[PDB]
Amino acid sequence: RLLSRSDWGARLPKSVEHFQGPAPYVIIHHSYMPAVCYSTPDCMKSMRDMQDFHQLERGWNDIGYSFGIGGDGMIYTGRGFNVIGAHAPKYNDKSVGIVLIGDWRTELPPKQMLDAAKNLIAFGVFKGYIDPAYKLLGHRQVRDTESPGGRLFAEISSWPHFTHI
């Protein structure tokens, strides 16, 4: 279920900065725009659209997230493991930031998206990129703290590793 950056046709990063040791945090995001992607070709386009917005419109080094999750249930590599992100203030150098593609302000993502996120986390721990005792957070805990978080936040609040901050 894991697609590399070259698999979705990513532009190279402008610059890459690494952080050391396994990430102590996992942070769950949604894209808002682009909207939910239904097939692998559509989700590859969603990843390029986010990268283009972050690199070309905002002048950032790369798509801000570590990984994306499509409606196809696939995992898309963004900056990847142990790369400083641009997704969560105070956590960019100590987390894996996972974006579920789509507008998940209120609605619950489909199961294959939730399953892909759990599989990515398990993979990251198994390969030594995520701390085994990682802390799981929602974006409304670290970044947009007045966002209510919706059914997605309620869902991740029930997962093992979910942490109050």
Author numbering: 14 to 178
Per the authors:
The structure of the PGRP domain comprises three α-helices and one central β-sheet composed of six β-strands, similar to the bacteriophage T7 lysozyme, a zinc-dependent amidase. The main difference between amidase and non-catalytic PGRPs is the presence of Zn2+ in only amidase PGRPs, which is coordinated by two histidines and one cysteine. We generated mutants to characterize the amidase reaction mechanism and solved the X-ray structures of wild-type Drosophila PGRP-LBPA/PC and its mutants in apo form or complexed to TCT.
Y78F and C160S PGRP-LBPA/PC mutant structures were elucidated to 1.30 Å and 1.40 Å resolution, respectively. The loop between the β6 sheet and the α3 helix is drifting apart from the active site with a RMSD of 2.37 Å, calculated on the Cα from the residues 148 to 172. Finally, the addition of Zn2+ to the reaction buffer used for activity assays allowed a small residual amidase activity of PGRP-LBPA/PC_C160S, whereas the absence of Zn2+ in the buffer totally abolished the amidase activity of PGRP-LBPA/PC_C160S, which is consistent with X-ray structural data. These data suggest that the C160 residue is needed to retain Zn2+ in the active site but not essential for residual amidase activity if Zn2+ is present in the media.
